[PDB]
Ligand binder design. Structure first.
Ligand SMILES: CC(C)(COP(=O)(O)OP(=O)(O)OC[C@H]1O[C@@H](n2cnc3c(N)ncnc32)[C@H](O)[C@@H]1OP(=O)(O)O)[C@@H](O)C(=O)NCCC(=O)NCCS
Length: 147
């Protein structure tokens, strides 16, 4: 019943990448998660049942914030894990003078879309043919969350 939330560290990347492989359509490589270890990128992980079950990564840029990725292992979904991770991330962003969280997500990524909408996210635009798809390209929906 213990649950731990903390900033992520380089040792977390293999499990984070495993969560991505399990949960995210078109998942980031292990090397993509090293890529946002660098400055202005901030991450958190949740530990439940003695292992990592979800992570969230934001980018602080200009005066506002971008949600780069959020994912929860499928066996731990629909229990509030992402909700808690997002709350922790938004507390950090709000303390660092941000008020709007940007998310870009594949049009077909239903779960991330419905999650963000129930957190207060609002669609503000579409980037057509923004992601590579198995054939052709896939639109990105663009959401804003005020906080
Ligand atoms: C989106 C995601 C992180 C949600 O994680 P989670 O821990 O299950 O989310 P929560 O339990 O905190 O969600 C909260 C509310 O979101 C809504 N919702 C969440 N997932 C949903 C889904 N798959 N389908 C429909 N509604 C959903 C629910 O209304 C949920 O509230 P409830 O549990 O009271 O029913 C998870 O589906 C995931 O990892 N998806 C793939 C990740 C991804 O694609 N990342 C890249 C784009 S950011």
């Amino acid at each position: 019943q213990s649950m731990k939330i903390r900033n992520w560290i380089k040792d977390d990347v293999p499990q984070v990448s495993e969560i991505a492989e399990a949960a995210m359509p078109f998942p980031w490589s292990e090397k993509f998660f090293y890529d946002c270890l660098k400055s202005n990128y901030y991450g958190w992980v949740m530990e439940s049942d003695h292992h990592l079950v979800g992570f969230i990564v934001i980018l602080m840029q200009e005066k506002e914030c971008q949600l780069m990725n959020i994912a929860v292992a499928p066996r731990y979904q629909r229990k509030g894990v992402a909700s808690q991770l997002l709350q922790h991330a938004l507390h950090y962003a709000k303390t660092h003078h941000a008020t709007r969280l940007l998310l870009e997500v594949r049009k077909s990524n239903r779960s991330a879309i419905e999650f963000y909408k129930k957190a207060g996210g609002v669609e503000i635009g579409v980037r057509k043919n923004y992601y590579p798809a198995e054939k052709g390209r896939e639109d990105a929906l663009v959401f804003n969350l005020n906080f």
